[PDB]
Amino acid sequence: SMNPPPPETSNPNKPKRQTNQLQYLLRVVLKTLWKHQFAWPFQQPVDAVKLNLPDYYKIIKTPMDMGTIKKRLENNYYWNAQECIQDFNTMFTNCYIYNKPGDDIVLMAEALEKLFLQKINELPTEE
Template sequence: MDGMNGPPVLDVPVVAPQETNEVESLNQRVDEIFVRVDQLEQQLTEVEQFYSSSNTKQPNAQKGGSNGKEKDKEKLVTNLKKRQQDSARREAVGVKRMQELMRQFGTLLRQITQHEWADPFMKPVDVIGLGLHDYYQVIEKPMDFSTIKSKMEAKDGTGYKNVREICSDVRLIFKNAMKYNDERDDVHVMAKSLLDKFETKWLQLLPKVDEEEKRRKEEEAELKQGMQLAQEAAHAKMARDLTFQLDEVDTNLEELREMVLQKCRYVMWQTRRNNID
């Protein structure tokens, strides 16, 4: 009667709870690796964008060390915090120097405004009272000493940033008067005379202004270079770390691959044994 039985039914291995847990563990590790790879891709993109936009050669991020140039950069930025503190200190000193220049320029202005011919230029031109109906057609930007004084004393950020800005407005006062009034007019003559006196006194202060501007440019260039070096060192380190982390991901993938192969071999072995039984 046994011969009437049909072909043997292959036993399908039943997945034990332990095996289910192992599969879930493998899936979890795969998910973790995918997340890690996404993070590394974002960091790699950041490094590539930095080097492509800064015209800086990307460092060689191989294991075993870095080239001498990288080491030099790292040495230069180890004291970045000190650089920032020094920069803040220099900025404060620079502000004081500029304030001193402003004070000296203020002395120059008082000498001009105390001149007997300065009265017509102390306040805005009374366009309506004097019947100067075409004044704003001729003069694009009116200026006077009271406006300059208010701007010099402004505390809301709208004031002058440097001495040259004040100098430009002082010149504008006299040039406006000379432009609007005829050469034979008293106001024109007074403005021309005071402008000459101002330029003479300005030339005495100009070397100090030039020296301060040169110093400011040098300090700004030094600060910019320090920040650039800091960014290069940071991205060089990031590139090296990426190499190590990518190697670690490769190792994890290889371990995972070996675990999956072992699991497959076990399942195949278990299936054959069940069939034989």
């Protein structure tokens, strides 16, 4: 069995910014979700080999996880906040697409997404 390469976290030719919205997405949004008791399945790419999910990457063609997002934020990968917000939403959507309602992992995603939405609701105006 085989995992795909992980999502890109480094691309020197991609133009970058460090903005107050992106700083909020690291210091508030990612940090809030990362410390949560349900974060652990989301803190790195899905290891479909060790988890015995051989169809995971047959179904999920845009993988995303908070380990990737953390690296992207810490390494200033993004131009704008929307790119990072999209990564979070991709991560939640993947979980809901792959799994069944009420599965433990879906409940975990829902708890993280509730906090994501609460924090994103107060994304600061760009300075």
